[PDB]
Amino acid sequence: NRTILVPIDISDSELTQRVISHVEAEAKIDDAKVHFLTVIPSLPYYASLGLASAELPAMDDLKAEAKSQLEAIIKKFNLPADRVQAHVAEGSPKDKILEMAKKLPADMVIIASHRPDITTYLLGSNAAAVVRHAECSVLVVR
Amino acid sequence: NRTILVPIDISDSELTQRVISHVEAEAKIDDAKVHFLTVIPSLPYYASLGPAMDDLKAEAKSQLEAIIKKFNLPADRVQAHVAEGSPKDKILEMAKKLPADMVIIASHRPDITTYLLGSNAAAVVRHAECSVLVVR
Amino acid sequence: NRTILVPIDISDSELTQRVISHVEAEAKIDDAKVHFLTVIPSLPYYASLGPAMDDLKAEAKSQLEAIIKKFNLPADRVQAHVAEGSPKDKILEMAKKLPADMVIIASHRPDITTYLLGSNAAAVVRHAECSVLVVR
Amino acid sequence: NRTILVPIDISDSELTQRVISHVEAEAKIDDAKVHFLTVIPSLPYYASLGLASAELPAMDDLKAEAKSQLEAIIKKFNLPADRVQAHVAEGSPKDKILEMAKKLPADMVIIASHRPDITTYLLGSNAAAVVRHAECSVLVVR
Ligand SMILES: Nc1ncnc2c1ncn2[C@@H]1O[C@H](COP(=O)(O)OP(=O)(O)OP(=O)(O)O)[C@@H](O)[C@H]1O
Ligand SMILES: Nc1ncnc2c1ncn2[C@@H]1O[C@H](COP(=O)(O)OP(=O)(O)OP(=O)(O)O)[C@@H](O)[C@H]1O
Ligand SMILES: Nc1ncnc2c1ncn2[C@@H]1O[C@H](COP(=O)(O)OP(=O)(O)OP(=O)(O)O)[C@@H](O)[C@H]1O
Ligand SMILES: Nc1ncnc2c1ncn2[C@@H]1O[C@H](COP(=O)(O)OP(=O)(O)OP(=O)(O)O)[C@@H](O)[C@H]1O
Ligand SMILES: [Cl-]
Ligand SMILES: [Cl-]
Ligand SMILES: [Cl-]
Ligand SMILES: [Cl-]
Ligand SMILES: [Mg+2]
Ligand SMILES: [Mg+2]
Ligand SMILES: [Mg+2]
Ligand SMILES: [Mg+2]
Known part of the structure; x- marks a missing residue:
């Protein structure tokens, strides 16, 4: 049965805190599987300034860390x-x-509109x- | 409790059929009030080139009421x-006035063209102050 | 050399007046060919509720030709x-068929509403394959 | 007279190479001043992974570097x-x-549509x- 994708940006409490009740409600409808995804963003510009000569941490370690934080966030959802x-x-x-929405495939993607503290843009990038691009339903949470 | 706005384009059966399951589900979560709205477009271009709106409104209301019978809602x-x-x-405007807690809309009329999201x-x-479910 | 497409909404004087200086400038850079296009909208909603297009087209052509006289172009x-x-x-479609090297369009009809970019x-x-100047 | 803003992402040759003839042509119309801006992006997510405990280079040095590269790119434009x-x-x-478009103020912002090598999104973020948000004319170059 149903598969829901919940993209999480571990860098902000509220983009997460907002979606909770929606994800729970959508899940309870029919005992859906909920996939949570955090993405460690690629740094093309910093790359051009010589930062990866210059050094950022190993991606293996960055992912392990991002995963540990995501795991704590997931536990905030009342889900089996x-x-x-x-x-x-x-x-x-x-x-x-x-990519993940297509690969799973997701029947719904649940996302926040944007970061709270910035009002100007009504939808985040x-x-x-x-x-626009998802092949499935997309719930924009405000 | 919750108020759900469901904009319906009475001229497109698929846009309407597509959201039925989502509206029914979203309503049942907490026995929400569901408002359906159909909008008769303004024709400012035609005004530049030179029946009664009362009558068009009554026909649209009539067609929307028939569409609502395709939903299982109290x-x-x-x-x-x-x-x-x-x-x-x-x-x-209706989302702000109700006010709505969610708007449920289909994405676009799928067709042979490149667009992915309707105007x-x-x-x-983008502009709603509440959550918006874009149905595919 | 270059082809410039200039979509005109004949019903809005300000959308048209606003691009005049930009079209004139863009043309003169290299003595471009300028194509003006006005589009009579489809009314699929009205079709669902139940003069001749030949005639509407001729009136629109006539109004577009008068609008073109507000531009200094060869x-x-x-x-x-x-x-x-x-x-x-x-x-x-016309941008692809010409094909156009640039499309020059105004942003939106400014008014008391929150929108910043017209549909x-x-x-x-978004969808043009060539450069697009959005005029404010 | 006229002021043109040309945002440049120093991390890609073509986003720059494309705009050249357009910027020159727009400038020659009436001997406009052309302001070129590169932005070193803030790294909120990497921040949350402890990278600024963990270390990126000084912003003063990152800006000096980004400026030196921008300066080389600017010389590719035939402008006084x-x-x-x-x-x-x-x-x-x-x-x-x-912000800069408002502060100057810019009469036109000239930007590329997106990065060449990625086709999927027809407009970059x-x-x-x-x-959408500029108060002035915006030329999207393809
Ligand atoms: N790095 C990420 N990994 C997983 N999901 C993300 C990530 N960034 C954003 N999201 C998802 O997108 C939602 C909206 O965030 P978005 O980035 O579009 O807004 P923003 O941060 O205000 O915009 P911008 O990033 O353009 O400043 C987030 O709540 C989250 O669901
Ligand atoms: N006349 C209308 N009245 C009420 N709601 C409408 C109307 N038109 C569209 N909608 C709502 O918006 C949805 C998406 O339709 P939209 O018009 O955005 O797609 P489209 O017709 O493909 O785009 P466009 O009208 O730009 O060509 C519909 O499912 C419906 O929920
Ligand atoms: N009927 C038309 N024919 C030809 N070009 C048009 C037409 N309508 C709009 N355009 C072009 O698009 C521009 C922007 O108008 P647009 O319709 O996008 O703004 P709007 O009317 O504020 O938005 P909407 O029609 O969504 O409410 C016009 O300046 C014109 O270049
Ligand atoms: N860091 C930057 N500083 C200055 N201008 C930029 C920067 N990033 C993008 N731009 C400007 O925006 C234009 C289009 O780039 P944009 O970032 O929107 O596309 P993209 O890289 O394909 O998208 P995304 O960044 O969303 O992957 C660039 O050509 C440039 O003019
Ligand atoms: Cl916005
Ligand atoms: Cl689209
Ligand atoms: Cl807008
Ligand atoms: Cl796109
Ligand atoms: Mg973000
Ligand atoms: Mg429509
Ligand atoms: Mg219009
Ligand atoms: Mg970019």
């Missing part, structure tokens, strides 16, 4: 342990979200791309 | 509305 | 066109 | 030296582009935001 799965990817958030 | 929790104007304008879905998902 | 480098359909559809400008800037 | 100015900022590219 067998209906949940944690994923970490590397890339543009929108690219990897859309990832939310906007995902809404 | 009769006492449902309301139908007809408006005149740009659809996105009147959808957004009204795009404006609604 | 008469031999200008062409006017009228189409029927969704404006963005027919704009994009046709948005689709054109 | 007194009608050109280089800027570096820190933040979201779209935020800082829009920064291009899309700038087109």
